[PDB]
Amino acid sequence: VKKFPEGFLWGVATASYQIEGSPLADGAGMSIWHTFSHTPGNVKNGDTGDVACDHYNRWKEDIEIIEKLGVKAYRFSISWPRILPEGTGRVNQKGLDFYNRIIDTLLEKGITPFVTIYHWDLPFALQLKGGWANREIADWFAEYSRVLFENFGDRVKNWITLNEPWVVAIVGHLYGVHAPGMRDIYVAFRAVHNLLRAHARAVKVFRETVKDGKIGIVFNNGYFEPASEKDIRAVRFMHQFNNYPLFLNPIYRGDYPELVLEFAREYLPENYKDDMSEIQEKIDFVGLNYYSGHLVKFDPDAKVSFVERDLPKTAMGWEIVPEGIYWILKKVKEEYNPPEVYITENGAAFDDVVSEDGRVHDQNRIDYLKAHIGQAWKAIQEGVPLKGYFVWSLLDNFEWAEGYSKRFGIVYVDYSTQKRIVKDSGYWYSNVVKNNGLED
Ligand SMILES: O[C@H]1[C@H](O)[C@@H](O)CN2CC[C@H](O)[C@H]12
């Protein structure tokens, strides 16, 4: 058997825009995901977050599912424009009320809330003022975070400033595949830098307002392997750029990673080091998301291309490489030694079907999760201070530019009826949580 530490936090995760629907209900302002998805051509099948899983109405039911599964922690995000419809200034009590009910319910049911302050749904009003490209967002984000802390910090004690700031910056502002849908490398690197400044300002406000809780930040990570000797530097660059070092080198060491500076120095503000002392504001934990591995080789035509491997893949076409989760956990301890780590997302999209027996037989997803949980266990045996693990996601949901076409839930959602059907993977996970680990 593989038993986890006493009190290890088994969780599930969601994000506001992906599950809630009702984006303009009760005085909410538009987000950049509302306006991005309502722009033709941006999202597969013209899908939007208008209805999603209708969690805005079905939240009590969904939490009852978490409870019934015995899951111990719920990572969810707050929609900024539900709270401050113009991004700064006016606070919307109905927005606070929505999350207050969720928080109180979780606590009543003995489930630990982990709140993601920013999970990509920037108020559209702030995008008009440049959004993450504008240095003043450190102020706007600080003011937003302060509202959350003042209203919820008496009850919520575990906070995450930003979800995947690499994606926010690069996918949103260089690739243009996510909101706000821009393709400018100078903007994208100013967004990187402003994300860090905003994160640090929020941590600073947190220390002034919630003297009893913990705060961290969540990064996407891939397991990059070289296509050979030589290539190994291509791997070094992808790790430094795409993984936690882009942000943790500033936080812990006060500068960007060496190979990021080699590639991107000219795109960063001329005097960006002036902000590094503030960026080093102390954090309580590091959240790592992990899903996939990539074979990487140097390619002269960022000087990196991916090499497709004949490995099992998910419906995203992502290679399944469970040892990657062990690697990234080892590597983060070795590089920055954060006092606590969480796996804040791990999961898989498969072509789920409801069988004639009314069940969803996702053995592929069970196998995926089991292998990664096993590799995480290993890291713990070797001294990584991993305190919890969160499955992405509780529910099938709006998967950004792929729309509803990609199902990551351990619970199936029939969008025609909003019916929830717990998948075999959800039942399997509940048993893992109950046993505090693998093989009964
Ligand atoms: O739905 C998104 C989520 O909002 C992000 O935090 C990153 N994720 C990685 C896998 C899947 O793309 C999931």
Coordinates of C-alpha atoms and ligand atoms in Angstrom, one line a residue:
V1 CA 0.0 0.0 0.0
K2 CA 1.0 3.7 -0.5
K3 CA -0.3 5.6 2.5
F4 CA 0.0 9.4 2.6
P5 CA 1.0 11.6 5.7
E6 CA -1.6 12.1 8.4
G7 CA -3.8 15.1 7.4
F8 CA -2.7 15.2 3.7
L9 CA -5.2 17.3 1.8
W10 CA -7.0 15.4 -1.0
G11 CA -8.9 17.9 -3.1
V12 CA -10.7 18.6 -6.4
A13 CA -10.4 21.9 -8.4
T14 CA -12.5 24.1 -10.6
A15 CA -12.5 27.8 -11.8
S16 CA -15.3 30.4 -11.9
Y17 CA -15.7 31.0 -15.6
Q18 CA -15.4 27.3 -16.5
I19 CA -18.2 26.1 -14.3
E20 CA -20.5 29.0 -13.1
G21 CA -22.4 30.3 -16.1
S22 CA -24.6 33.4 -15.5
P23 CA -21.6 35.7 -16.1
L24 CA -23.7 38.9 -16.0
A25 CA -26.1 37.8 -13.2
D26 CA -26.6 40.0 -10.1
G27 CA -24.7 43.1 -11.2
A28 CA -21.5 41.3 -12.3
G29 CA -19.3 43.2 -14.8
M30 CA -18.1 41.5 -18.1
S31 CA -14.8 39.6 -18.0
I32 CA -12.3 39.3 -20.8
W33 CA -13.4 35.7 -21.2
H34 CA -17.0 36.8 -21.8
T35 CA -15.9 39.2 -24.6
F36 CA -13.3 36.8 -26.0
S37 CA -15.7 33.9 -26.2
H38 CA -18.4 36.1 -27.7
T39 CA -16.0 37.0 -30.5
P40 CA -16.5 34.6 -33.4
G41 CA -13.5 32.4 -34.3
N42 CA -11.9 32.4 -30.8
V43 CA -13.5 29.3 -29.3
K44 CA -14.2 25.9 -30.8
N45 CA -17.9 25.5 -31.9
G46 CA -18.6 29.1 -30.8
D47 CA -18.9 27.8 -27.2
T48 CA -19.0 30.4 -24.3
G49 CA -19.2 30.4 -20.5
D50 CA -22.8 31.7 -20.6
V51 CA -24.3 28.6 -19.0
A52 CA -21.3 26.2 -18.5
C53 CA -22.3 23.8 -15.6
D54 CA -24.8 26.3 -14.2
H55 CA -22.8 26.1 -10.9
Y56 CA -24.1 29.7 -10.2
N57 CA -27.4 27.9 -9.5
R58 CA -26.3 24.4 -8.7
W59 CA -23.4 25.1 -6.3
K60 CA -25.1 23.4 -3.2
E61 CA -25.6 20.2 -5.2
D62 CA -22.0 20.3 -6.5
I63 CA -20.6 20.8 -2.9
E64 CA -22.9 17.9 -1.8
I65 CA -21.1 15.8 -4.3
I66 CA -17.7 16.8 -2.9
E67 CA -19.0 15.9 0.6
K68 CA -20.5 12.5 -0.6
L69 CA -17.2 11.6 -2.2
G70 CA -15.4 12.5 1.1
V71 CA -13.1 14.9 -0.6
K72 CA -11.3 17.0 1.9
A73 CA -10.4 20.2 0.1
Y74 CA -12.0 22.2 -2.7
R75 CA -9.9 24.6 -4.8
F76 CA -12.2 27.1 -6.5
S77 CA -11.7 30.6 -8.0
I78 CA -13.5 33.9 -7.5
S79 CA -14.7 35.9 -10.5
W80 CA -13.1 39.4 -10.1
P81 CA -15.8 41.2 -12.0
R82 CA -18.5 39.6 -9.8
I83 CA -16.9 41.3 -6.9
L84 CA -15.7 44.6 -8.4
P85 CA -17.7 45.0 -11.7
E86 CA -15.4 47.8 -12.9
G87 CA -12.4 46.0 -11.6
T88 CA -11.7 48.7 -8.9
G89 CA -13.9 51.0 -6.8
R90 CA -17.4 49.6 -6.4
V91 CA -17.9 46.3 -4.5
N92 CA -20.9 44.1 -5.5
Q93 CA -22.5 42.6 -2.4
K94 CA -24.4 40.0 -4.4
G95 CA -21.0 38.8 -5.7
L96 CA -19.6 38.5 -2.2
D97 CA -22.9 36.8 -1.1
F98 CA -22.4 34.0 -3.8
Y99 CA -19.0 33.1 -2.5
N100 CA -19.9 33.6 1.1
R101 CA -22.6 30.8 0.8
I102 CA -20.0 28.5 -0.9
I103 CA -17.5 29.2 1.8
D104 CA -19.9 28.7 4.7
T105 CA -21.3 25.5 3.2
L106 CA -17.8 24.0 2.7
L107 CA -16.9 24.8 6.3
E108 CA -20.2 23.4 7.7
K109 CA -19.3 20.2 5.8
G110 CA -15.7 20.0 7.0
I111 CA -14.2 20.7 3.5
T112 CA -11.2 23.0 3.3
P113 CA -11.6 25.9 0.9
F114 CA -8.5 26.8 -1.2
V115 CA -9.3 30.0 -3.0
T116 CA -7.7 31.1 -6.3
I117 CA -7.9 34.8 -6.5
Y118 CA -7.2 35.1 -10.2
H119 CA -8.1 32.3 -12.6
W120 CA -8.1 34.3 -15.9
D121 CA -11.4 36.1 -15.8
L122 CA -10.0 39.7 -15.7
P123 CA -12.7 42.4 -15.5
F124 CA -13.2 43.7 -19.0
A125 CA -13.2 47.3 -17.6
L126 CA -9.5 46.8 -16.7
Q127 CA -8.6 45.3 -20.1
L128 CA -9.8 48.6 -21.6
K129 CA -7.0 50.2 -19.5
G130 CA -4.4 47.6 -20.8
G131 CA -5.1 44.8 -18.3
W132 CA -1.9 42.9 -17.4
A133 CA 0.2 45.1 -19.8
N134 CA -0.4 48.2 -17.5
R135 CA 1.9 48.6 -14.4
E136 CA -1.1 50.0 -12.5
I137 CA -2.6 46.4 -12.3
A138 CA -0.3 45.8 -9.3
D139 CA -2.5 48.4 -7.5
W140 CA -5.8 47.1 -9.0
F141 CA -5.0 43.5 -8.0
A142 CA -3.9 44.6 -4.5
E143 CA -7.2 46.4 -4.0
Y144 CA -9.2 43.4 -5.3
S145 CA -7.2 40.9 -3.1
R146 CA -7.7 43.3 -0.1
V147 CA -11.5 43.1 -0.6
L148 CA -11.4 39.3 -0.6
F149 CA -9.2 39.1 2.5
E150 CA -11.4 41.6 4.4
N151 CA -14.6 39.7 3.5
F152 CA -13.4 36.0 3.5
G153 CA -10.1 35.9 5.4
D154 CA -11.9 35.1 8.7
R155 CA -12.9 31.8 7.3
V156 CA -10.7 31.0 4.3
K157 CA -7.1 30.4 5.4
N158 CA -5.5 29.0 2.2
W159 CA -5.1 31.5 -0.8
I160 CA -3.6 31.4 -4.3
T161 CA -2.8 34.7 -5.9
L162 CA -2.5 33.6 -9.6
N163 CA -3.3 30.5 -11.6
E164 CA -0.7 29.7 -14.3
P165 CA 0.7 33.2 -14.9
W166 CA 2.8 31.8 -17.8
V167 CA -0.4 30.9 -19.6
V168 CA -2.0 34.3 -18.8
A169 CA 1.0 36.1 -20.2
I170 CA 2.1 33.9 -23.1
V171 CA -1.0 32.2 -24.3
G172 CA -3.2 35.3 -23.7
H173 CA -0.7 38.0 -25.1
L174 CA 1.8 36.3 -27.3
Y175 CA -0.1 33.3 -28.8
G176 CA -3.4 35.1 -28.7
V177 CA -5.2 31.8 -28.1
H178 CA -6.6 32.9 -24.8
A179 CA -8.2 36.2 -23.7
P180 CA -7.4 39.0 -24.3
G181 CA -6.2 37.4 -27.5
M182 CA -3.1 39.5 -28.3
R183 CA 0.1 38.6 -30.3
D184 CA 2.8 40.9 -29.1
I185 CA 6.0 39.6 -27.4
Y186 CA 6.8 43.0 -25.7
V187 CA 3.3 43.1 -24.2
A188 CA 3.5 39.4 -23.1
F189 CA 6.7 39.9 -21.2
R190 CA 5.4 43.0 -19.5
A191 CA 2.4 40.9 -18.5
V192 CA 4.9 38.3 -17.0
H193 CA 6.5 41.1 -15.0
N194 CA 3.3 42.8 -13.9
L195 CA 1.8 39.4 -12.9
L196 CA 4.8 39.1 -10.5
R197 CA 4.4 42.6 -9.2
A198 CA 0.7 42.1 -8.6
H199 CA 1.2 38.7 -6.9
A200 CA 3.8 40.3 -4.6
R201 CA 1.5 43.3 -3.7
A202 CA -1.3 40.9 -2.9
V203 CA 0.9 38.8 -0.6
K204 CA 2.0 42.1 1.1
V205 CA -1.7 43.1 1.7
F206 CA -2.4 39.6 2.9
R207 CA 0.2 40.0 5.8
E208 CA -1.6 43.2 6.8
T209 CA -5.1 41.7 6.7
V210 CA -5.1 37.9 7.4
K211 CA -2.5 37.4 10.1
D212 CA -3.6 33.7 10.5
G213 CA -3.6 32.2 7.0
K214 CA -1.3 31.0 4.2
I215 CA -0.8 32.3 0.6
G216 CA 0.9 30.9 -2.5
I217 CA 0.8 30.8 -6.3
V218 CA 0.2 28.1 -8.9
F219 CA 2.4 27.3 -12.0
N220 CA 1.8 25.0 -15.0
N221 CA 4.7 22.6 -15.6
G222 CA 5.8 20.1 -18.2
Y223 CA 8.3 17.3 -18.1
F224 CA 10.7 18.2 -20.8
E225 CA 13.1 15.4 -21.9
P226 CA 15.8 15.8 -24.5
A227 CA 15.5 14.1 -27.9
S228 CA 19.1 12.9 -27.4
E229 CA 22.4 14.1 -26.2
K230 CA 23.8 16.9 -27.6
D231 CA 19.1 19.6 -27.0
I232 CA 19.7 19.3 -23.3
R233 CA 19.9 23.2 -23.3
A234 CA 16.6 23.3 -25.2
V235 CA 15.3 21.3 -22.2
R236 CA 17.0 23.7 -19.8
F237 CA 15.3 26.7 -21.6
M238 CA 11.8 25.1 -21.6
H239 CA 12.1 24.3 -17.9
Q240 CA 13.3 27.8 -17.1
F241 CA 10.7 29.5 -19.3
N242 CA 7.6 27.2 -19.2
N243 CA 7.9 25.9 -15.7
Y244 CA 8.0 27.4 -12.1
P245 CA 11.5 29.0 -12.5
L246 CA 10.2 31.9 -14.6
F247 CA 8.4 33.1 -11.5
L248 CA 10.3 31.4 -8.6
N249 CA 13.7 32.7 -9.7
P250 CA 12.3 36.3 -9.2
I251 CA 10.5 35.3 -5.9
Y252 CA 13.4 33.4 -4.3
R253 CA 16.4 34.9 -6.1
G254 CA 15.4 38.3 -7.3
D255 CA 15.9 37.9 -11.1
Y256 CA 14.6 36.0 -14.1
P257 CA 16.3 32.6 -14.9
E258 CA 19.4 32.9 -17.1
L259 CA 18.1 31.4 -20.3
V260 CA 14.9 33.4 -20.0
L261 CA 17.0 36.5 -20.0
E262 CA 19.0 35.2 -22.9
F263 CA 15.8 34.9 -25.0
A264 CA 13.7 37.8 -23.6
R265 CA 15.8 40.5 -22.1
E266 CA 14.9 43.0 -24.8
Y267 CA 11.2 42.4 -24.2
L268 CA 11.2 43.1 -20.5
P269 CA 11.1 46.7 -19.1
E270 CA 14.5 48.4 -19.3
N271 CA 14.5 48.9 -15.5
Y272 CA 12.7 45.7 -14.4
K273 CA 15.3 44.9 -11.7
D274 CA 14.0 48.0 -9.8
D275 CA 10.9 45.9 -9.0
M276 CA 12.7 42.7 -7.9
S277 CA 13.1 43.5 -4.2
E278 CA 9.3 43.8 -3.9
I279 CA 8.8 40.7 -6.0
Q280 CA 10.7 38.7 -3.3
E281 CA 7.8 39.1 -0.8
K282 CA 7.7 35.8 1.2
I283 CA 5.2 33.1 0.1
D284 CA 3.9 30.2 2.2
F285 CA 3.6 27.5 -0.4
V286 CA 4.1 26.7 -4.1
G287 CA 1.3 25.2 -6.1
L288 CA 2.4 23.0 -9.1
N289 CA 0.1 21.9 -11.9
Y290 CA 1.3 18.9 -13.9
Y291 CA -0.3 16.9 -16.8
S292 CA 2.2 16.0 -19.5
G293 CA 5.7 15.4 -20.9
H294 CA 7.3 16.7 -24.1
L295 CA 10.3 15.5 -26.1
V296 CA 12.2 18.5 -27.0
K297 CA 15.0 19.2 -29.5
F298 CA 16.8 22.4 -30.5
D299 CA 15.4 23.8 -33.8
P300 CA 17.1 26.8 -35.5
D301 CA 14.0 28.0 -37.1
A302 CA 12.4 30.2 -29.3
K303 CA 14.8 27.7 -31.0
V304 CA 12.7 24.8 -29.7
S305 CA 10.3 22.4 -31.4
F306 CA 8.4 19.4 -29.9
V307 CA 9.0 15.9 -31.1
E308 CA 6.0 13.7 -31.1
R309 CA 6.5 10.3 -29.3
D310 CA 4.6 7.1 -29.7
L311 CA 3.3 7.2 -26.1
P312 CA -0.3 6.9 -24.7
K313 CA -2.0 10.3 -25.1
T314 CA -5.1 11.9 -23.7
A315 CA -7.9 13.5 -25.8
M316 CA -5.8 16.7 -25.7
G317 CA -3.1 14.8 -27.5
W318 CA -0.9 15.2 -24.4
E319 CA 1.6 12.4 -23.7
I320 CA 1.0 10.5 -20.5
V321 CA 4.3 10.5 -18.6
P322 CA 3.6 9.9 -14.8
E323 CA 7.3 10.1 -13.8
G324 CA 7.1 13.8 -14.7
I325 CA 5.1 14.6 -11.6
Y326 CA 7.8 13.0 -9.5
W327 CA 10.5 14.9 -11.4
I328 CA 8.9 18.4 -11.0
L329 CA 8.4 17.8 -7.3
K330 CA 12.0 16.7 -6.8
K331 CA 13.2 19.6 -8.9
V332 CA 11.3 22.4 -7.1
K333 CA 12.7 21.2 -3.7
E334 CA 16.2 21.1 -5.2
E335 CA 16.0 24.5 -6.9
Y336 CA 14.0 26.7 -4.5
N337 CA 13.2 24.5 -1.4
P338 CA 9.7 26.0 -0.8
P339 CA 8.5 25.2 2.7
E340 CA 5.2 23.6 1.4
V341 CA 4.2 22.3 -2.0
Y342 CA 0.8 21.3 -3.4
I343 CA -0.1 19.6 -6.6
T344 CA -2.9 22.1 -7.3
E345 CA -4.0 20.3 -10.6
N346 CA -3.5 16.9 -12.2
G347 CA -6.0 15.3 -14.4
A348 CA -6.9 14.1 -17.9
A349 CA -9.3 14.6 -20.8
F350 CA -10.8 11.5 -22.3
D351 CA -13.7 10.9 -24.7
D352 CA -16.1 10.0 -21.9
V353 CA -19.4 8.2 -22.7
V354 CA -22.4 7.3 -20.5
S355 CA -22.8 3.5 -21.1
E356 CA -26.2 1.7 -21.2
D357 CA -25.7 0.9 -17.5
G358 CA -25.9 4.6 -16.7
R359 CA -22.2 4.7 -15.6
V360 CA -19.1 6.3 -17.1
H361 CA -16.4 3.7 -17.3
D362 CA -13.3 5.9 -17.5
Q363 CA -10.6 3.3 -16.7
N364 CA -8.2 5.4 -18.7
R365 CA -8.7 8.3 -16.3
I366 CA -8.3 6.0 -13.2
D367 CA -5.1 4.6 -14.6
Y368 CA -3.7 8.1 -15.3
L369 CA -4.6 9.4 -11.8
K370 CA -3.3 6.2 -10.1
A371 CA 0.1 6.5 -11.7
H372 CA 0.5 10.1 -10.9
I373 CA -0.6 9.7 -7.3
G374 CA 1.9 6.9 -7.0
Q375 CA 4.8 9.1 -8.3
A376 CA 3.7 11.9 -5.9
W377 CA 3.8 9.4 -3.0
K378 CA 7.4 8.6 -4.0
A379 CA 8.4 12.3 -3.9
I380 CA 7.0 12.4 -0.3
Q381 CA 9.1 9.3 0.7
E382 CA 12.1 11.3 -0.5
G383 CA 11.4 14.4 1.5
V384 CA 9.4 16.7 -0.7
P385 CA 7.0 18.6 1.6
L386 CA 3.9 17.8 -0.5
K387 CA 0.9 18.7 1.6
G388 CA -2.0 18.0 -0.8
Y389 CA -3.1 16.9 -4.2
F390 CA -6.0 18.3 -6.3
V391 CA -7.7 16.5 -9.2
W392 CA -8.6 18.8 -12.1
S393 CA -11.5 18.8 -12.2
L394 CA -14.6 18.0 -10.1
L395 CA -16.8 18.6 -13.2
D396 CA -16.6 18.5 -17.0
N397 CA -16.5 22.1 -17.8
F398 CA -15.7 24.9 -20.3
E399 CA -12.2 24.1 -21.4
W400 CA -11.2 27.6 -22.6
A401 CA -10.6 27.7 -26.4
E402 CA -11.6 24.0 -26.8
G403 CA -15.0 24.8 -25.3
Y404 CA -17.1 21.9 -24.0
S405 CA -15.4 19.4 -26.3
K406 CA -12.8 18.3 -23.6
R407 CA -14.1 16.6 -20.5
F408 CA -11.7 16.7 -17.5
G409 CA -14.2 15.9 -14.7
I410 CA -14.3 13.0 -12.3
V411 CA -18.0 13.9 -12.6
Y412 CA -19.7 13.8 -16.0
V413 CA -22.0 16.7 -16.9
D414 CA -24.8 16.2 -19.4
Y415 CA -25.1 19.7 -20.7
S416 CA -28.6 19.2 -22.2
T417 CA -30.0 18.6 -18.7
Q418 CA -27.2 19.7 -16.3
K419 CA -27.4 16.2 -14.8
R420 CA -24.2 15.1 -12.9
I421 CA -23.1 11.5 -13.2
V422 CA -20.1 10.5 -10.9
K423 CA -17.6 8.7 -13.2
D424 CA -15.8 5.5 -12.2
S425 CA -12.7 7.7 -11.6
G426 CA -14.7 9.8 -9.0
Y427 CA -15.8 6.7 -7.2
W428 CA -12.2 5.4 -7.3
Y429 CA -10.8 8.7 -6.1
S430 CA -13.2 8.8 -3.1
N431 CA -11.8 5.4 -2.0
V432 CA -8.2 6.8 -2.3
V433 CA -9.2 9.7 -0.1
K434 CA -11.0 7.5 2.4
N435 CA -7.9 5.2 2.6
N436 CA -5.6 8.2 2.6
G437 CA -3.7 6.6 -0.3
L438 CA -3.3 3.8 -2.9
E439 CA -4.3 0.1 -3.0
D440 CA -6.8 -0.3 -0.2
Ligands
LIG1 O1 -9.0 23.8 -17.5 C1 -7.7 24.2 -17.3 C2 -7.5 25.1 -16.1 O2 -8.3 26.2 -16.0 C3 -6.0 25.6 -16.0 O3 -5.7 25.9 -14.7 C4 -5.0 24.7 -16.6 N1 -5.4 23.3 -16.9 C5 -4.5 22.3 -17.3 C6 -5.4 21.3 -18.0 C7 -6.7 22.1 -18.3 O4 -6.3 22.8 -19.5 C8 -6.9 22.9 -17.1

